[PDB]
Design an enzyme around this catalytic site. Sequence first.
Site, PDB file in Angstrom:
ATOM      1  N   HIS A   1       0.780  -1.231   0.000  1.00  0.00           N
ATOM      2  CA  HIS A   1       0.000   0.000   0.000  1.00  0.00           C
ATOM      3  C   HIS A   1       0.816   1.289   0.000  1.00  0.00           C
ATOM      4  O   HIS A   1       0.534   2.212   0.767  1.00  0.00           O
ATOM      5  CB  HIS A   1      -0.953   0.024   1.193  1.00  0.00           C
ATOM      6  CG  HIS A   1      -2.145  -0.844   1.015  1.00  0.00           C
ATOM      7  ND1 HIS A   1      -3.057  -0.640   0.009  1.00  0.00           N
ATOM      8  CD2 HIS A   1      -2.580  -1.919   1.713  1.00  0.00           C
ATOM      9  CE1 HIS A   1      -4.016  -1.541   0.108  1.00  0.00           C
ATOM     10  NE2 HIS A   1      -3.739  -2.339   1.120  1.00  0.00           N
TER      11      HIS A   1
ATOM     12  N   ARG B   1      -9.098  18.907  11.668  1.00  0.00           N
ATOM     13  CA  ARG B   1      -7.964  19.439  12.397  1.00  0.00           C
ATOM     14  C   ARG B   1      -7.456  20.738  11.858  1.00  0.00           C
ATOM     15  O   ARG B   1      -6.501  21.261  12.382  1.00  0.00           O
ATOM     16  CB  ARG B   1      -6.831  18.414  12.382  1.00  0.00           C
ATOM     17  CG  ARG B   1      -7.251  17.079  12.944  1.00  0.00           C
ATOM     18  CD  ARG B   1      -7.798  17.170  14.366  1.00  0.00           C
ATOM     19  NE  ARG B   1      -6.712  17.438  15.291  1.00  0.00           N
ATOM     20  CZ  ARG B   1      -6.796  17.257  16.628  1.00  0.00           C
ATOM     21  NH1 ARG B   1      -7.901  16.809  17.198  1.00  0.00           N
ATOM     22  NH2 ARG B   1      -5.764  17.551  17.374  1.00  0.00           N
TER      23      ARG B   1
ATOM     24  N   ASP C   1      -7.852   0.204  -8.236  1.00  0.00           N
ATOM     25  CA  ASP C   1      -8.197   1.586  -7.915  1.00  0.00           C
ATOM     26  C   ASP C   1      -7.904   2.539  -9.088  1.00  0.00           C
ATOM     27  O   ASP C   1      -8.306   3.711  -9.101  1.00  0.00           O
ATOM     28  CB  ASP C   1      -7.431   2.068  -6.680  1.00  0.00           C
ATOM     29  CG  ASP C   1      -7.789   1.324  -5.443  1.00  0.00           C
ATOM     30  OD1 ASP C   1      -8.817   0.651  -5.355  1.00  0.00           O
ATOM     31  OD2 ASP C   1      -7.068   1.345  -4.479  1.00  0.00           O
TER      32      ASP C   1
ATOM     33  N   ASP D   1      -1.927  -5.827  -3.323  1.00  0.00           N
ATOM     34  CA  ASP D   1      -2.269  -4.507  -2.802  1.00  0.00           C
ATOM     35  C   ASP D   1      -1.012  -3.717  -2.622  1.00  0.00           C
ATOM     36  O   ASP D   1      -0.637  -3.331  -1.558  1.00  0.00           O
ATOM     37  CB  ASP D   1      -3.104  -4.573  -1.533  1.00  0.00           C
ATOM     38  CG  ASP D   1      -4.593  -4.616  -1.808  1.00  0.00           C
ATOM     39  OD1 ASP D   1      -5.059  -4.726  -2.973  1.00  0.00           O
ATOM     40  OD2 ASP D   1      -5.396  -4.574  -0.883  1.00  0.00           O
TER      41      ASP D   1
ATOM     42  N   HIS E   1      -6.943  -3.529  -4.677  1.00  0.00           N
ATOM     43  CA  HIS E   1      -6.523  -2.147  -4.843  1.00  0.00           C
ATOM     44  C   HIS E   1      -5.729  -1.925  -6.095  1.00  0.00           C
ATOM     45  O   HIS E   1      -5.557  -0.815  -6.478  1.00  0.00           O
ATOM     46  CB  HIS E   1      -5.834  -1.620  -3.611  1.00  0.00           C
ATOM     47  CG  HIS E   1      -6.779  -1.333  -2.488  1.00  0.00           C
ATOM     48  ND1 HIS E   1      -7.445  -0.138  -2.384  1.00  0.00           N
ATOM     49  CD2 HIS E   1      -7.242  -2.108  -1.470  1.00  0.00           C
ATOM     50  CE1 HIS E   1      -8.247  -0.165  -1.332  1.00  0.00           C
ATOM     51  NE2 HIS E   1      -8.138  -1.345  -0.752  1.00  0.00           N
TER      52      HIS E   1
END
Length: 519
Positions: free
Chosen positions: A18, A379, A95, A59, A92
């Site tokens: 990843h 934030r 993606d 992935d 993934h």
Amino acid sequence: YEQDKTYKITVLHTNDHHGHFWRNEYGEYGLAAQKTLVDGIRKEVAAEGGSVLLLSGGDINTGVPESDLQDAEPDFRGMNLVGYDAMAIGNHEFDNPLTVLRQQEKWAKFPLLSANIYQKSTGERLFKPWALFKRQDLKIAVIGLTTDDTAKIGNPEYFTDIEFRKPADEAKLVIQELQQTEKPDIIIAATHMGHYDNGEHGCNAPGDVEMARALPAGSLAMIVGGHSQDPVCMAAENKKQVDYVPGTPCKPDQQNGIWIVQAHEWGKYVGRADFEFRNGEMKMVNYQLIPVNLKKKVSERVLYTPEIAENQQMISLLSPFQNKGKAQLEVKIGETNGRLEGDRDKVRFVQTNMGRLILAAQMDRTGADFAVMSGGGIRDSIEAGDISYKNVLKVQPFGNVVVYADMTGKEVIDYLTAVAQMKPDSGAYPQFANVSFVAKDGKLNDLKIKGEPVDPAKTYRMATLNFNATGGDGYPRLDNKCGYVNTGFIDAEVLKAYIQKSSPLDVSVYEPKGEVSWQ
Ligand code: NI
């Protein structure tokens, strides 16, 4: 293979990389350290006349901006230098358009394998089902398998003329054809399917354990896994350790005579399965998960196991990618015509536009009907004007993962009621999208989703963050719900990609108009 001789095979593996080609901000993992580790295991095993095979459970894509921004080119090139032999294709890897995946196959000097991914219009495999390796005079077959949840998850995008068939069924066919045509001495399956204790996959597609159980016993030496993102280290029969500790013994799973392994995620570990091969059968001699400079907060960070130096050649290859990645965080990805309010004394007291933007982004990525997060998770603000990824990362700095749950209307009522109890002036104060009500006396009146009363007979999809889904800020746990899915997409990437495609943003569209209230 020459008879009555014991041969030595070491299988190394990682998964769910990843985008973690680079070390993290505490000097953990990264492919430069991985390279040094693997090179040393190679030298060691070759000095003992044995053989090495390095497999990935897939992935490789998605999770780190400096990677994502470059279509994981650094990761695949770094993998070439580490010398991976093969990987299974992960969900993934889809993606991006197939153009990009085809391009990753070019970059990669190793095959990206999956047997069960088929082209709809032709009924033919899109990818190689397996690869054959000669180690000494052993013939070793590695099959790949991809979870058939791939195209079912979230808001699916790039599955034009593609389908994912049941991997367990494909495995039977593929093992049979290999034995018949090649008679491999050893078959291993690199898969992207998941380890679930005792095969308890819940509402997820069946994974490795179940497949192992359904295949003829010992018909694979091992399954090198991923997707679920665990260290497969068994505390007890059919029970993985919870909170596995780097540098401690790891006992891999064994199910119907097939070893099942997984090395967690992000290059955190390189797993090492040493086997001895004699007369067609495989015996596991030793198993461990080798940490790649993992550290524990103890305020400072300390190694669990010996420091592994970063391979210089990997640093010189990857730095330009790192550096180009960082630079690109400064670049304009979009613009807004109004200030997106992320200030603490707003987001913890009322619904704001930044709340709605984020949640819009998360709904869009997941196909959700509604969404929630806690205000303590926004934030920073973004001023009117141009927006960079660096701005998005200030707003969403903690690297939470976007998740979703399919829930009944009744579970929606109960979840929102409970969340509505959280009070202003704390981080637990909730930002909602597509939710309307008037809270009175711990109870939600006129509860609606997308303008419509909640029908307990209907299923609704909700997006939020793993943090809240696992009970952060006292939110109801969703991670045990059948129908809960962790998508693996990082909050900040999801907000950035949504900003980029939606831009120029007209903030008025994200302005709350009193949909929720408390009396
Ligand atoms: Ni996956």
